[PDB]
Amino acid sequence: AGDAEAGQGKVAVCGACHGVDGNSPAPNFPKLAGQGERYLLKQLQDIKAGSTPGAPEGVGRKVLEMTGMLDPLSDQDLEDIAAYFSSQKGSVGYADPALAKQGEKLFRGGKLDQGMPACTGCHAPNGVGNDLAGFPKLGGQHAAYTAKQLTDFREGNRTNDGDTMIMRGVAAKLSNKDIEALSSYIQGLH
C-alpha cells in the first residue's frame, strides 16, 4: 500500500498534465483523482515497463506522453503516487443527451445480439468500479480519454488487460459510434 503524503511529493512532473490533484480539464489526459489505488498502481507499473526506451514491443502499456518518466521511481514510489491520487476527490463532467442516451443503453444493457456484456456488472451502475476486484472507476472520466481506451482495446493498441483478457473482448464488439456514445455517458456518470 502507498503513503499518500509521501506521494504528494513525488508528482511534480505530473502536474502540468494531470493537475496537482489529478483533475485537470485537459480532455485527453485521464483524471486520476479518486481512481482506485490498486488500479493506479498497476497502470503505473505497466506504463513504466512499456514506456521505457528499448522496452520490448508489446510489453506493458506504452504511453508516448510519459516515455521514460516513471523510470527513476521505485515500486514503493509508485504505490505512494497511487495512494496520493486515489485520496483525491474525483469530479464529474458533461453528458450530452444527444450521445449519452444511447451510451446509457449500451452501458446498462450491452449488445447481447453480439455477445457483449453490459458494463455495469464490473464498473458499477454509477461507474465507481471495484478497486478490490481490479475494476477501474470510469464515472466522470474525460470522454476523449475513455474513447481512446475503448478504441485502443478494440484495435490491440492497449494490451495490458492480459491478466483477465476482459476488455479486448468487450471492446471488439463496439463501433465508433458506440464508443462515442459510451464515453459521453460515462463523462456524466456518478
Annotated binding site: which residue ranges? 14, 17-18, 66, 119, 122-123, 167
Among 4, 21, 23, 32, binds ligand HEC (CB under 6 A): 32
Q: Three-state SS for 82?
A: helix
Task: Work out whether 117 is an interface residue with ligand HEC (CB under 6 A).
Answer: yes
Cα–Cα distance measured from residue 162 to residue 39, given in angstroms and rounded to the nearest whole number: 14
With b for 16 or more beta-carbon neighbours within 10 A and e for fewer, the 125-139 pattern comes to eebbbbbeebbbbbb
H or E segment at 97?
Answer: helix 97-109
Contacts (Cβ under 8 Å, ≥6 apart) of 97? none
Min. distance of Cβ 182 from ligand HEC in angstroms?
5
Cα–Cα distance measured from residue 185 to residue 58, given in angstroms and rounded to the nearest whole number: 31
Among 43, 45, 51, 86, binds ligand HEC (CB under 6 A): 43
Task: Work out whether 18 is an interface residue with ligand HEC (CB under 6 A).
Answer: yes
For residue 115, give the amino acid letter: G
Cα–Cα distance measured from residue 36 to residue 31, given in angstroms and rounded to the nearest whole number: 12
- Burial level of 166, CB count in 10 A (0-12/13-18/19+)? middle
Which residue's CB is nearer to ligand HEC, number 97 or number 108? 108
Min. distance of Cβ 16 from ligand HEC in angstroms?
6
Task: Work out whether 119 is an interface residue with ligand HEC (CB under 6 A).
Answer: yes
Closest C-alpha to 25, from 94, 74, 73, 84 = 94
Which residue's CB is nearer to ligand HEC, number 2 or number 136? 136
Which residue's CB is nearer to ligand HEC, number 128 or number 138? 138
Find how far residue 15's CA is from the centre of its chain: 17
Task: Work out whether 189 is an interface residue with ligand HEC (CB under 6 A).
Answer: no
Site for ligand HEC in 57-76 (CB under 6 A): 63, 65-66, 69-70
State the residues that interact with ligand HEC by CB under 6 A.
11, 13-14, 16-18, 28-30, 32, 40, 42-44, 63, 65-66, 69-70, 81, 117, 119, 121-123, 134-136, 138, 146, 148-150, 160-161, 164, 166-167, 170, 182
